[PDB]
């Protein structure tokens, strides 16, 4: 990893190996043209110390790099720790197609849906878009598809929408705490720069309509899609797995609205009205009745 | 503390009243912050155990 | 009579009940006075450099009789100017040179000076001057150094007890914190034994130092312990006992008081018994020998005949040894009191535990503890001990530290040496042991009498003194070595280390950082912050929970709320709205002393030690016209528990009702109805906003924004100006009236504000000019319209109309519903200016030069380039458009028949030049605003640069020309007036100068002489102007410096505007976060009964859960003010008369309770009144104090005066279905600010990226279309799904797979949908790492 | 931050490999295409001849016609 | 380098099938190593795998 | 020359410098073998000799280089037109110890300047000017030829008449003997005629 173009500027154990290479040379220098019995008197001790420092310097002594008081990270050092091989390397990988969503209200889109800004969309479907372009013959050449997509064709938009129909997606919030953090839903394109979310998975997402991010996941394998629509699909996590109570607990102002439905002040306009019910929508919306009205008798089926 | 505050969100607050009224909010902020991490550590330990 | 020549244009409506006394502080004096003093010429060397150099000024030869001293130093004038250096990019600073003196004195003569080299001025470094804005110009860059807040130097008796003891024992420790030298601690162990500690090492004996400190155990005990005579002569067992001295103990037996026994045997000590024993004279009374056995021999006594070691000190008396001592030694033997109820030896207890008894042995233990090995040679241990604290050049803590320690000893004098002293440590141990037995109180960490704020001048002084210390060693080394020389004191004067130290302190230090440019308020705040992190205070982000609490003495130090919500909360205090600084290191608070009922207007700064003394009355307290009090029992504070006190029980009064709220908080009005936690969130967000394209002045603020921009210095004040001379969209020229015009001065000022300056936070600051033409203005007048400012206010945000109702789920919890209207007028459009650059870098394979010669390139790219390769100013840019095109030549080719034919056919490239071109960023597009370039001196490319150079020269020459013309006009007028009354008609001298006929002889006696003098003046002026032009020209092309081997570095800065779209971030000054998230077609947003819609429909259900009454107060105030403005504009629509509109506004500014004095029709002229009207064309600006806001009563009343609903409820019409709306709602206008975290980084995607060289993973945080890394908790969640395919692909497809990546990409192309597990490369890598360390890696099958 | 960066540039060789892999090709056709792509000069002209490619293939079935079609 | 870190004939082949000297630079040589410099004409993966 | 002029510094940090240490002598004593001791002593002898060699290289390429840069003022004074055919024997006699005892120490060493890296062998020069008070410096004549190429013939590189006359205007009089054109990768005249 050269820095300025000229000098490689290698670091750490190889750099330590540099000094060890001295010893490695010195061993050869001890091998011939030096008296190993007379030499290893002070040589072998520094040899053991440096071999340690290359394998592990933290055990004894202090090996610092140029102009930095920090110690040396030896062979085992990059195996453990928060910055080692045992760091977030087993399942800590950076994903291929996801990242850094924007969150806002999905007032529309009854529960089985999820709204996403289209800009990131079809950057995801790029493999699917190319597959469609070749399969539909819109680009016999891969470079032809590259040009056509780079041209931002509306036919490509139609193709993407056709693909975006039958392919669900996965979404999750920032700090995973429950199994409720990630759900799966039908993706719907929306003209904006943020995600649209129904009040369906809101509390489970544990965010709060504020500066926040979400994560989108694309089921590539068919098994992935089948499982996500089967298990990750939000349209199945009805009841909370732990308490047993409903996971989907309506807690927004819709409660206030239903409350305003079933109330009666004392006796409103047409208090004594009695009817069948089907045109009560007229008697309320047009005129005659209020949700806050009492004594409205009705034949209930 | 000795003196309580007889005040409302529609009545305002006094200067020293507000000043006293600050320690609790500061403490709650600090508590939420320092508690998220400990909860996470315990959860991680349990999950490893599972 | 508030003249306010700047603010007479517009007078905001105040609501301040209390009568103001003291103005706001200079509001930048803290970040200025320290550096101002740091180079202040002081007649006595008291601090800073006058102390730092005077500390180690004399450098002496090692008895070489050669000395080095300095008479004085002076700092040089600047090289590049502030903006000029900013363009250049160097650290704007000033060199300093000291007249040095190398004096060699001859031997064999008493201090006999032989030669002096006191003729060399030594410039050892350059001083970085602090700005008039107090901003660093380090490397050109905008930056500031955060102040220091640490613990004072002294001695304190800390408690350090509780659960840490792990034994249920209260520890009585003590620590001395010196400003330099070693740290000493005297702790009390669980065995009630003192332990000495130095620099937190293993505990040392308590008495080890005293024995080492030339103090015998006899002297130590005699000073420490009270010795009883115990005069038992002839076996009398009689002691002289004082019931006053020792009492309170039940008399066991043989207790008699001067004959008659006052204390019975087995009788408990009574106050009557002690009183009787004191009333009658008590002589040596007989006591049981049991008290002797318990008693210890205080003094070490030897027998009269032999000096035997019988009865050693610190030994309890033994009855068998008692007879031996009484018969042989003496009859009276010293014993001690050690009254365990009230006292305790605890040192004689430590005296027995002492391992060594000799001073030399004690010195050797000290060396053994300090130095683990290398035992001393009777000189090393002693030297180390003497230098530890008894040295002048090692501890020398502080004279202020001396005052603190002396006060801790309650010493009459507070002036002492920073070095240690014996009696001081003695008194320290005395106080510590007394408190252990109980004599006083331990100190308090949260106490403000213990913390001190160190300012920037002291820090720089510390760095400078540190550098001088390192230099003095080599100085003395060179003075001693080869002292037989008469060289100037520059033999080894190297400024490189001093400069490096000063820079590193200023440049790379966590205590400093680049400044906040978000808005004027954010800049006025960050530069005034106070945090304890860094070289002092807390060492780690951990280690504290009570460190961040609200100190009881902190009521007048920081604003209580303003601190971030991140990890470091409670550790970032803000200078109070009037926070003053103490003499030594602390901060006081001005307050009005209350004397005899009336409250004196005189205010003095008071400190925490002073603060707990007097009685101070609360702000919301009435004061009689006599100054007296209204209510006799008034809530006042005496010692931290405020309570009602009598009108004669008060001693002080505060300054202002805001004296507890600082600037970072003072801005938000309607404070009293604002909840605490939400207020903190809102104010910490408040500095997070960006100036808008249209500066919508803040309608209802807190009255401060005028000054908040005035002292902030993002606008221009009219320094000594009387009227406007020239006004321009690039500068302003003002002619100074002769009254204030300096003699021999131009009497003209040119403020050349710079538009489109890319400030610190990548925002777009473009100062705008206030006046139009010939505006008469007095001194300091607001002349420049700054970013997010409007005629002098902190114009941070847009005043948008809104209405309170939830609707259709689009306003679920915290959403804002901006319809298409605010899209149309595009208010709150974002501005930005962002830069880039390239380098030339003459290389080995061949220099890369900007020639626009790109081989194998598309022509359209070059369509925007110049022959220089630059792009002309004013072009458009999208995609990866080439920006700065260098061509790096490559290795030459041989004859190369294929390449020979290629050069023969096409030629001119031969692939010799490889593309070293710069291109526009991917996903960043804009329009090129402005450019610059700096080439290493000696490189004279200047292809498209000589044009820019010429432009700069033209501007400079034009600037120089004006003063020259003015002076020439003055001289020509003087000459022509001299020709007056001489028969020379003005038509002649008007036709041509002609030297006024070249002294025609109008008087011919002095007219010739005066003409000669004037011609001399004219020629001299011509020469001087030419010289100035030449100097400026040479400066213009003085040559740029490109240290990094680049022939030239050229920067191009482009512009951008951003459109507020769904999902972006906004908030309110009443503390509420939210996102504008619903784009409703304009046929949707409900319309008023008069038809006027509102563009913001706020989610209302959140009203309770945060006690955001302030939002409602805002709604009401905004409705009323928008109504007042609309009515005034409507009056204007009929072109109403001046008198009528004047009366209307006079009644408008007269409603409500008593706040301010201002009356129309008495001061403002009709056009001036007309002007005030015309500016007040969208409302009435409102000033509601935070702690003294206006009553909602006056608001609701003025609503009737505004013919508006005092309740505010109003009819609504649903734009979607056209139904008259139930629940008449109160709607109004509220301010809203756009915060930094705009969408411009929110959206992010990726499809296929590159693998790393190691671990083959994706990039990261949008770095080269980077991608974030998944979470281990998320992985556990994925397991909880049991989605084996999902986790498998995530660990395979979304991981380091290369050969699996290609196979999967091919399958996705082919629609196969298959992933191949194989084995991760990281697995083999870890196997190798095992094999890399001392273990074979072998995996079985 | 750490200067560590491991960006693996393809330099259009991996682009050619992905093109042949994504192009419909048989085992022999893919091997011929890979052999053709292996010995390519910097300027972009093939360093070796088609007959050399057929010889390096070492297959009697591999002929000049197949090599020409692959090229 | 030579007989040390990043040395040819050790840890595997060079970036191309070409040997270190410059000989055996083609796809024809699969396991042949040049006499001037012995570097197997192969891929560079074993640089991490050796 | 970011500052316009600076000491070349002889790349002081990169200059090899071996360090003798007392503890290193102690460790050599730990190699107490008498034959090894004699070897280490003779090695110190040859190492002092080599110290003389490196000091020789450095001091020669320092003093002779200061002499060569003495012709220059404020980094490059007149570009390449600042020196003549350099006598290496002259610089060695300037070193005054191995006076004209030539070697290769400044050779295999290159001084970098504002323009770029140029060898100490390049600090030496050769005679290219032939008449017109010229007898020295190939770089100056080549730079004159380069300025002539900035205005060379269009149908051909500046003809040996054109280039030679430009050099004569410089007074060097390199003649067609230096007219270099084939050496400047410039072919003949008529072959340089091409379609417009």
mmCIF file of N, CA and C in Angstrom, chain C residues 1140-1219:
data_model
loop_
_atom_site.group_PDB
_atom_site.id
_atom_site.type_symbol
_atom_site.label_atom_id
_atom_site.label_comp_id
_atom_site.label_asym_id
_atom_site.label_seq_id
_atom_site.Cartn_x
_atom_site.Cartn_y
_atom_site.Cartn_z
ATOM 1 N N UNK C 1140 -52.531 59.036 8.922
ATOM 2 C CA UNK C 1140 -53.418 57.946 9.316
ATOM 3 C C UNK C 1140 -52.636 56.672 9.621
ATOM 4 N N UNK C 1141 -51.739 56.271 8.718
ATOM 5 C CA UNK C 1141 -50.909 55.102 8.979
ATOM 6 C C UNK C 1141 -50.033 55.325 10.202
ATOM 7 N N UNK C 1142 -49.589 56.565 10.411
ATOM 8 C CA UNK C 1142 -48.787 56.881 11.587
ATOM 9 C C UNK C 1142 -49.578 56.665 12.868
ATOM 10 N N UNK C 1143 -50.826 57.129 12.905
ATOM 11 C CA UNK C 1143 -51.658 56.909 14.085
ATOM 12 C C UNK C 1143 -51.953 55.429 14.280
ATOM 13 N N UNK C 1144 -52.209 54.708 13.185
ATOM 14 C CA UNK C 1144 -52.477 53.278 13.284
ATOM 15 C C UNK C 1144 -51.290 52.542 13.881
ATOM 16 N N UNK C 1145 -50.089 52.809 13.370
ATOM 17 C CA UNK C 1145 -48.895 52.164 13.899
ATOM 18 C C UNK C 1145 -48.617 52.630 15.325
ATOM 19 N N UNK C 1146 -48.946 53.888 15.636
ATOM 20 C CA UNK C 1146 -48.725 54.402 16.987
ATOM 21 C C UNK C 1146 -49.594 53.674 18.001
ATOM 22 N N UNK C 1147 -50.843 53.388 17.634
ATOM 23 C CA UNK C 1147 -51.686 52.561 18.492
ATOM 24 C C UNK C 1147 -51.209 51.114 18.512
ATOM 25 N N UNK C 1148 -50.725 50.605 17.376
ATOM 26 C CA UNK C 1148 -50.221 49.242 17.305
ATOM 27 C C UNK C 1148 -49.030 49.009 18.220
ATOM 28 N N UNK C 1149 -48.083 49.935 18.250
ATOM 29 C CA UNK C 1149 -46.910 49.798 19.095
ATOM 30 C C UNK C 1149 -47.152 50.290 20.515
ATOM 31 N N UNK C 1150 -48.403 50.554 20.887
ATOM 32 C CA UNK C 1150 -48.711 51.076 22.210
ATOM 33 C C UNK C 1150 -49.510 50.104 23.074
ATOM 34 N N UNK C 1151 -50.025 49.020 22.504
ATOM 35 C CA UNK C 1151 -50.843 48.084 23.265
ATOM 36 C C UNK C 1151 -49.976 47.212 24.165
ATOM 37 N N UNK C 1152 -50.575 46.706 25.236
ATOM 38 C CA UNK C 1152 -49.930 45.762 26.124
ATOM 39 C C UNK C 1152 -49.391 46.425 27.379
ATOM 40 N N UNK C 1153 -48.640 45.634 28.143
ATOM 41 C CA UNK C 1153 -48.049 46.103 29.386
ATOM 42 C C UNK C 1153 -46.775 46.899 29.096
ATOM 43 N N UNK C 1154 -46.246 47.542 30.138
ATOM 44 C CA UNK C 1154 -45.120 48.458 29.992
ATOM 45 C C UNK C 1154 -43.816 47.726 29.696
ATOM 46 N N UNK C 1155 -43.208 48.009 28.544
ATOM 47 C CA UNK C 1155 -41.942 47.402 28.160
ATOM 48 C C UNK C 1155 -40.892 48.445 27.787
ATOM 49 N N UNK C 1156 -41.152 49.245 26.752
ATOM 50 C CA UNK C 1156 -40.116 50.050 26.118
ATOM 51 C C UNK C 1156 -40.653 51.444 25.833
ATOM 52 N N UNK C 1157 -39.742 52.390 25.608
ATOM 53 C CA UNK C 1157 -40.098 53.775 25.316
ATOM 54 C C UNK C 1157 -39.733 54.088 23.868
ATOM 55 N N UNK C 1158 -40.751 54.290 23.032
ATOM 56 C CA UNK C 1158 -40.572 54.716 21.650
ATOM 57 C C UNK C 1158 -41.885 55.287 21.142
ATOM 58 N N UNK C 1159 -41.818 56.465 20.522
ATOM 59 C CA UNK C 1159 -43.018 57.190 20.120
ATOM 60 C C UNK C 1159 -42.830 57.716 18.705
ATOM 61 N N UNK C 1160 -43.835 57.486 17.864
ATOM 62 C CA UNK C 1160 -43.839 58.007 16.509
ATOM 63 C C UNK C 1160 -44.416 59.421 16.517
ATOM 64 N N UNK C 1161 -44.368 60.087 15.362
ATOM 65 C CA UNK C 1161 -44.811 61.460 15.137
ATOM 66 C C UNK C 1161 -44.003 62.473 15.936
ATOM 67 N N UNK C 1162 -42.986 62.039 16.673
ATOM 68 C CA UNK C 1162 -42.107 62.932 17.412
ATOM 69 C C UNK C 1162 -40.673 62.907 16.919
ATOM 70 N N UNK C 1163 -40.185 61.763 16.442
ATOM 71 C CA UNK C 1163 -38.808 61.631 15.988
ATOM 72 C C UNK C 1163 -38.698 61.329 14.502
ATOM 73 N N UNK C 1164 -39.326 60.257 14.033
ATOM 74 C CA UNK C 1164 -39.196 59.866 12.638
ATOM 75 C C UNK C 1164 -39.848 60.911 11.748
ATOM 76 N N UNK C 1165 -39.123 61.348 10.725
ATOM 77 C CA UNK C 1165 -39.713 62.177 9.684
ATOM 78 C C UNK C 1165 -40.731 61.334 8.917
ATOM 79 N N UNK C 1166 -41.601 61.995 8.156
ATOM 80 C CA UNK C 1166 -42.647 61.286 7.434
ATOM 81 C C UNK C 1166 -42.100 60.220 6.498
ATOM 82 N N UNK C 1167 -41.085 60.538 5.702
ATOM 83 C CA UNK C 1167 -40.406 59.523 4.915
ATOM 84 C C UNK C 1167 -39.688 58.506 5.785
ATOM 85 N N UNK C 1168 -39.051 58.955 6.865
ATOM 86 C CA UNK C 1168 -38.503 58.022 7.836
ATOM 87 C C UNK C 1168 -39.592 57.144 8.423
ATOM 88 N N UNK C 1169 -40.715 57.743 8.819
ATOM 89 C CA UNK C 1169 -41.878 56.942 9.171
ATOM 90 C C UNK C 1169 -42.320 56.119 7.976
ATOM 91 N N UNK C 1170 -42.351 56.729 6.791
ATOM 92 C CA UNK C 1170 -42.711 55.982 5.591
ATOM 93 C C UNK C 1170 -41.742 54.831 5.368
ATOM 94 N N UNK C 1171 -40.449 55.078 5.578
ATOM 95 C CA UNK C 1171 -39.465 54.015 5.436
ATOM 96 C C UNK C 1171 -39.733 52.876 6.407
ATOM 97 N N UNK C 1172 -39.942 53.201 7.687
ATOM 98 C CA UNK C 1172 -40.251 52.181 8.681
ATOM 99 C C UNK C 1172 -41.478 51.387 8.274
ATOM 100 N N UNK C 1173 -42.459 52.064 7.689
ATOM 101 C CA UNK C 1173 -43.631 51.361 7.195
ATOM 102 C C UNK C 1173 -43.264 50.403 6.077
ATOM 103 N N UNK C 1174 -42.515 50.891 5.092
ATOM 104 C CA UNK C 1174 -42.239 50.097 3.906
ATOM 105 C C UNK C 1174 -41.476 48.832 4.250
ATOM 106 N N UNK C 1175 -40.510 48.914 5.164
ATOM 107 C CA UNK C 1175 -39.788 47.707 5.551
ATOM 108 C C UNK C 1175 -40.705 46.740 6.290
ATOM 109 N N UNK C 1176 -41.601 47.269 7.121
ATOM 110 C CA UNK C 1176 -42.548 46.454 7.876
ATOM 111 C C UNK C 1176 -43.693 46.023 6.964
ATOM 112 N N UNK C 1177 -43.332 45.274 5.921
ATOM 113 C CA UNK C 1177 -44.265 44.910 4.870
ATOM 114 C C UNK C 1177 -44.727 43.459 4.917
ATOM 115 N N UNK C 1178 -44.345 42.687 5.932
ATOM 116 C CA UNK C 1178 -44.826 41.317 6.062
ATOM 117 C C UNK C 1178 -45.138 40.943 7.507
ATOM 118 N N UNK C 1179 -45.255 41.925 8.399
ATOM 119 C CA UNK C 1179 -45.536 41.641 9.794
ATOM 120 C C UNK C 1179 -44.961 42.673 10.740
ATOM 121 N N UNK C 1180 -45.069 42.418 12.040
ATOM 122 C CA UNK C 1180 -44.382 43.244 13.025
ATOM 123 C C UNK C 1180 -43.368 42.392 13.777
ATOM 124 N N UNK C 1181 -42.069 42.675 13.665
ATOM 125 C CA UNK C 1181 -41.064 41.868 14.377
ATOM 126 C C UNK C 1181 -41.285 41.942 15.881
ATOM 127 N N UNK C 1182 -41.125 40.805 16.551
ATOM 128 C CA UNK C 1182 -41.516 40.665 17.945
ATOM 129 C C UNK C 1182 -40.300 40.264 18.763
ATOM 130 N N UNK C 1183 -40.171 40.853 19.949
ATOM 131 C CA UNK C 1183 -39.078 40.569 20.870
ATOM 132 C C UNK C 1183 -39.663 40.144 22.208
ATOM 133 N N UNK C 1184 -39.848 38.842 22.387
ATOM 134 C CA UNK C 1184 -40.331 38.323 23.652
ATOM 135 C C UNK C 1184 -39.160 37.832 24.477
ATOM 136 N N UNK C 1185 -38.946 38.384 25.666
ATOM 137 C CA UNK C 1185 -37.851 37.900 26.513
ATOM 138 C C UNK C 1185 -38.101 36.472 26.968
ATOM 139 N N UNK C 1186 -37.005 35.752 27.204
ATOM 140 C CA UNK C 1186 -37.112 34.345 27.592
ATOM 141 C C UNK C 1186 -37.689 34.227 28.997
ATOM 142 N N UNK C 1187 -36.995 34.799 29.982
ATOM 143 C CA UNK C 1187 -37.438 34.767 31.369
ATOM 144 C C UNK C 1187 -38.512 35.814 31.651
ATOM 145 N N UNK C 1188 -38.762 36.702 30.695
ATOM 146 C CA UNK C 1188 -39.705 37.800 30.858
ATOM 147 C C UNK C 1188 -40.571 37.941 29.616
ATOM 148 N N UNK C 1189 -41.118 36.831 29.140
ATOM 149 C CA UNK C 1189 -41.979 36.868 27.979
ATOM 150 C C UNK C 1189 -43.277 37.616 28.241
ATOM 151 N N UNK C 1190 -43.930 37.981 27.141
ATOM 152 C CA UNK C 1190 -45.203 38.680 27.210
ATOM 153 C C UNK C 1190 -46.315 37.732 27.642
ATOM 154 N N UNK C 1191 -47.286 38.287 28.357
ATOM 155 C CA UNK C 1191 -48.447 37.538 28.802
ATOM 156 C C UNK C 1191 -49.344 37.193 27.618
ATOM 157 N N UNK C 1192 -49.891 35.976 27.656
ATOM 158 C CA UNK C 1192 -50.871 35.580 26.651
ATOM 159 C C UNK C 1192 -52.117 36.448 26.744
ATOM 160 N N UNK C 1193 -52.297 37.128 27.879
ATOM 161 C CA UNK C 1193 -53.401 38.068 28.020
ATOM 162 C C UNK C 1193 -53.276 39.214 27.025
ATOM 163 N N UNK C 1194 -52.113 39.871 26.989
ATOM 164 C CA UNK C 1194 -51.913 40.950 26.029
ATOM 165 C C UNK C 1194 -51.984 40.426 24.601
ATOM 166 N N UNK C 1195 -51.563 39.178 24.388
ATOM 167 C CA UNK C 1195 -51.657 38.576 23.060
ATOM 168 C C UNK C 1195 -53.112 38.456 22.627
ATOM 169 N N UNK C 1196 -53.943 37.827 23.460
ATOM 170 C CA UNK C 1196 -55.347 37.656 23.120
ATOM 171 C C UNK C 1196 -56.040 39.002 22.966
ATOM 172 N N UNK C 1197 -55.663 39.983 23.787
ATOM 173 C CA UNK C 1197 -56.233 41.316 23.641
ATOM 174 C C UNK C 1197 -55.866 41.940 22.303
ATOM 175 N N UNK C 1198 -54.582 41.929 21.942
ATOM 176 C CA UNK C 1198 -54.167 42.486 20.660
ATOM 177 C C UNK C 1198 -54.806 41.737 19.501
ATOM 178 N N UNK C 1199 -55.151 40.464 19.705
ATOM 179 C CA UNK C 1199 -55.911 39.742 18.694
ATOM 180 C C UNK C 1199 -57.228 40.434 18.392
ATOM 181 N N UNK C 1200 -57.946 40.875 19.420
ATOM 182 C CA UNK C 1200 -59.077 41.762 19.192
ATOM 183 C C UNK C 1200 -58.635 43.063 18.544
ATOM 184 N N UNK C 1201 -57.526 43.644 19.006
ATOM 185 C CA UNK C 1201 -56.986 44.821 18.340
ATOM 186 C C UNK C 1201 -56.574 44.518 16.911
ATOM 187 N N UNK C 1202 -56.233 43.270 16.617
ATOM 188 C CA UNK C 1202 -55.965 42.872 15.254
ATOM 189 C C UNK C 1202 -57.209 42.327 14.593
ATOM 190 N N UNK C 1203 -58.351 42.508 15.255
ATOM 191 C CA UNK C 1203 -59.634 41.998 14.781
ATOM 192 C C UNK C 1203 -59.546 40.495 14.512
ATOM 193 N N UNK C 1204 -58.869 39.802 15.418
ATOM 194 C CA UNK C 1204 -58.633 38.378 15.270
ATOM 195 C C UNK C 1204 -59.112 37.635 16.506
ATOM 196 N N UNK C 1205 -59.410 36.343 16.369
ATOM 197 C CA UNK C 1205 -59.922 35.574 17.511
ATOM 198 C C UNK C 1205 -58.888 35.477 18.622
ATOM 199 N N UNK C 1206 -59.225 36.059 19.776
ATOM 200 C CA UNK C 1206 -58.368 35.925 20.948
ATOM 201 C C UNK C 1206 -58.148 34.463 21.302
ATOM 202 N N UNK C 1207 -59.208 33.657 21.244
ATOM 203 C CA UNK C 1207 -59.045 32.216 21.362
ATOM 204 C C UNK C 1207 -58.234 31.662 20.203
ATOM 205 N N UNK C 1208 -58.444 32.185 19.000
ATOM 206 C CA UNK C 1208 -57.717 31.745 17.836
ATOM 207 C C UNK C 1208 -58.421 30.707 16.997
ATOM 208 N N UNK C 1209 -59.392 29.994 17.556
ATOM 209 C CA UNK C 1209 -60.168 29.029 16.796
ATOM 210 C C UNK C 1209 -60.840 29.717 15.613
ATOM 211 N N UNK C 1210 -60.804 29.044 14.465
ATOM 212 C CA UNK C 1210 -61.283 29.634 13.219
ATOM 213 C C UNK C 1210 -61.794 28.513 12.328
ATOM 214 N N UNK C 1211 -62.720 28.853 11.438
ATOM 215 C CA UNK C 1211 -63.319 27.864 10.555
ATOM 216 C C UNK C 1211 -62.295 27.330 9.559
ATOM 217 N N UNK C 1212 -62.533 26.108 9.082
ATOM 218 C CA UNK C 1212 -61.640 25.453 8.139
ATOM 219 C C UNK C 1212 -62.446 24.777 7.041
ATOM 220 N N UNK C 1213 -61.864 24.733 5.846
ATOM 221 C CA UNK C 1213 -62.468 24.094 4.688
ATOM 222 C C UNK C 1213 -61.518 23.054 4.109
ATOM 223 N N UNK C 1214 -62.034 21.841 3.938
ATOM 224 C CA UNK C 1214 -61.225 20.717 3.487
ATOM 225 C C UNK C 1214 -61.049 20.780 1.979
ATOM 226 N N UNK C 1215 -59.824 21.030 1.540
ATOM 227 C CA UNK C 1215 -59.569 21.186 0.127
ATOM 228 C C UNK C 1215 -59.806 19.961 -0.715
ATOM 229 N N UNK C 1216 -59.941 18.795 -0.103
ATOM 230 C CA UNK C 1216 -60.163 17.572 -0.850
ATOM 231 C C UNK C 1216 -61.628 17.274 -1.105
ATOM 232 N N UNK C 1217 -62.497 17.456 -0.113
ATOM 233 C CA UNK C 1217 -63.915 17.181 -0.282
ATOM 234 C C UNK C 1217 -64.806 18.391 -0.066
ATOM 235 N N UNK C 1218 -64.257 19.522 0.363
ATOM 236 C CA UNK C 1218 -65.037 20.741 0.485
ATOM 237 C C UNK C 1218 -66.116 20.705 1.545
ATOM 238 N N UNK C 1219 -65.836 20.101 2.692
ATOM 239 C CA UNK C 1219 -66.757 20.108 3.812
ATOM 240 C C UNK C 1219 -66.285 21.126 4.839
#
